[PDB]
Write an enzyme that holds these catalytic residues in place. Structure first.
Site, PDB file in Angstrom:
ATOM      1  N   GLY A 147     -31.568 -61.680  58.558  1.00  0.00           N
ATOM      2  CA  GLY A 147     -30.475 -61.121  57.808  1.00  0.00           C
ATOM      3  C   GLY A 147     -30.903 -61.132  56.315  1.00  0.00           C
ATOM      4  N   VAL A 185     -29.466 -61.934  52.304  1.00  0.00           N
ATOM      5  CA  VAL A 185     -28.279 -62.433  51.587  1.00  0.00           C
ATOM      6  C   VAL A 185     -27.913 -62.024  50.439  1.00  0.00           C
ATOM      7  CG1 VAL A 185     -27.479 -64.772  51.202  1.00  0.00           C
ATOM      8  CG2 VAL A 185     -29.327 -64.619  52.495  1.00  0.00           C
ATOM      9  N   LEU A 222     -30.004 -61.479  46.868  1.00  0.00           N
ATOM     10  CA  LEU A 222     -30.529 -62.934  46.537  1.00  0.00           C
ATOM     11  C   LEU A 222     -31.827 -62.998  47.326  1.00  0.00           C
ATOM     12  CD1 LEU A 222     -27.350 -65.007  46.729  1.00  0.00           C
ATOM     13  CD2 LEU A 222     -28.562 -64.631  44.541  1.00  0.00           C
ATOM     14  N   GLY A 223     -31.940 -62.617  48.599  1.00  0.00           N
ATOM     15  CA  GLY A 223     -33.255 -62.827  49.236  1.00  0.00           C
ATOM     16  C   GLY A 223     -32.777 -62.151  50.627  1.00  0.00           C
ATOM     17  N   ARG A 275     -36.295 -77.567  49.934  1.00  0.00           N
ATOM     18  CA  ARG A 275     -36.079 -76.138  50.003  1.00  0.00           C
ATOM     19  C   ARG A 275     -34.935 -75.913  50.896  1.00  0.00           C
ATOM     20  NH1 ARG A 275     -40.409 -77.252  53.200  1.00  0.00           N
ATOM     21  NH2 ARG A 275     -40.135 -77.126  55.179  1.00  0.00           N
ATOM     22  N   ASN A 276     -34.438 -76.623  51.860  1.00  0.00           N
ATOM     23  CA  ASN A 276     -33.178 -76.409  52.492  1.00  0.00           C
ATOM     24  C   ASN A 276     -31.938 -77.200  51.974  1.00  0.00           C
ATOM     25  OD1 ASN A 276     -33.910 -74.426  54.593  1.00  0.00           O
ATOM     26  ND2 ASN A 276     -35.017 -75.922  55.844  1.00  0.00           N
ATOM     27  N   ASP A 308     -29.563 -74.710  56.000  1.00  0.00           N
ATOM     28  CA  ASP A 308     -30.937 -74.480  56.746  1.00  0.00           C
ATOM     29  C   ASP A 308     -30.994 -73.234  56.366  1.00  0.00           C
ATOM     30  OD1 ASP A 308     -31.815 -74.438  60.439  1.00  0.00           O
ATOM     31  OD2 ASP A 308     -32.944 -74.778  58.663  1.00  0.00           O
TER      32      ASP A 308
END
Ligand SMILES: O=C(O)c1cc2c(-c3cccc4ccccc34)nccc2n1Cc1noc(-c2ccccc2)n1
Ligand SMILES: [Cl-]
Length: 283
Positions: free
Chosen positions: A22, A24, A16-17, A148-149, A162
């Protein structure tokens, strides 16, 4: 106290990103009591200390408007953290997708393309306030509350997280001074002296309200990071959005009182957004 998931149950589908710490992935997960969609964060890196600390924290933060954490997977490498999947992604893109230009931006089959109305904008606001009321009670300071969070799931369910993806995808929303600060959502004491508190989060909440009612616009979009810093420290306030009713603007103005102790408590803000939402349910 952290829940453990067997690696055989996690079925990776696609990345996903990527955050700095890390990657995702969208994944399939069996037995979370049976093909359930999940968001799996895979740790890149010592860091085994940070992973444990975060997993313990996420295990403790359980709320209706906080992104669900389902556990970790320590059985092998990479180290995995499993979270709920929210179909509509982050709330800034969602707002941008359901704004004034929603017909132009919609796909052929999209359901009722068009801007979100007052009731909806109020439903999103109230849910974000609710998740922030929870954090305040636990004496937890978010530090990076922004659309965005926030994640959106089917049935206009809005939840707070977050994300490391949010720092990458929206890198422009942060200023280097290496610590990347979201200066446009920060009050003056936070910009000036890195003083994060429940009162700086309520300020951020007011900025989040402005994002909802401008349908995803960047606070101080017309300004550079240094021009925004001086506007915020000088005490300039964000102009009333056209889609913003005056009473919602009074709520923002409550969140933006110069003195942190003078700012409205998140509970009062929540009660007011809920009161307004309730007064527009049938009209
Ligand atoms: O990059 C990440 O860190 C990440 C991305 C996640 C997404 C995501 C999925 C699809 C599209 C996106 C687009 C924009 C941002 C997010 C998404 N969904 C869920 C978790 C996600 N995480 C892990 C995470 N890190 O902190 C949290 C967390 C949860 C509960 C309370 C406090 C913090 N979760
Ligand atoms: Cl007003």
């Amino acid at each position: 106290c952290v829940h453990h998931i067997k690696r055989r149950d996690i079925v990776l589908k696609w990345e996903l990103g990527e955050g700095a710490f890390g990657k995702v992935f969208l994944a399939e997960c069996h037995n979370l009591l049976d093909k359930m969609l999940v968001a799996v964060k895979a740790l890149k890196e010592s860091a085994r200390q940070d992973f444990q600390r975060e997993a313990e924290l996420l295990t403790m933060l359980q709320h209706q408007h906080i992104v669900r954490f389902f556990g970790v997977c320590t059985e092998g490498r990479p180290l995995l953290m499993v979270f709920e999947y929210m179909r509509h992604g982050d709330l800034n893109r969602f707002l941008r997708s359901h704004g004034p230009d929603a017909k132009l931006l919609a796909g052929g089959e999209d359901v009722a393309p068009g801007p979100l109305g007052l009731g909806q904008l109020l439903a999103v606001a109230s849910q974000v306030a609710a998740g922030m009321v929870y954090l305040a009670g636990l004496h937890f300071v978010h530090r990076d509350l922004a659309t965005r969070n926030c994640l959106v799931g089917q049935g206009l369910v809005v939840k707070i997280g977050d994300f490391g993806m949010s720092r990458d995808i929206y890198s422009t929303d942060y200023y280097r001074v290496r610590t990347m600060l979201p200066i446009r959502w920060m009050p003056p004491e936070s910009i000036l002296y890195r003083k994060f508190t429940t009162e700086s989060d309520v300020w951020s909440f007011g900025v989040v309200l402005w994002e909802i009612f401008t349908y995803g616009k960047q606070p101080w979009y017309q300004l550079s990071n240094t021009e925004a810093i001086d506007c915020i420290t000088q005490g300039r306030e964000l102009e009333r959005p056209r889609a913003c009713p005056p009473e919602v603007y009074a709520i923002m103005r409550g969140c933006w009182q110069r003195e942190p102790q003078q700012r409205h408590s998140i509970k009062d803000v929540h009660a007011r957004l809920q009161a307004l939402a309730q007064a527009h349910h049938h009209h």
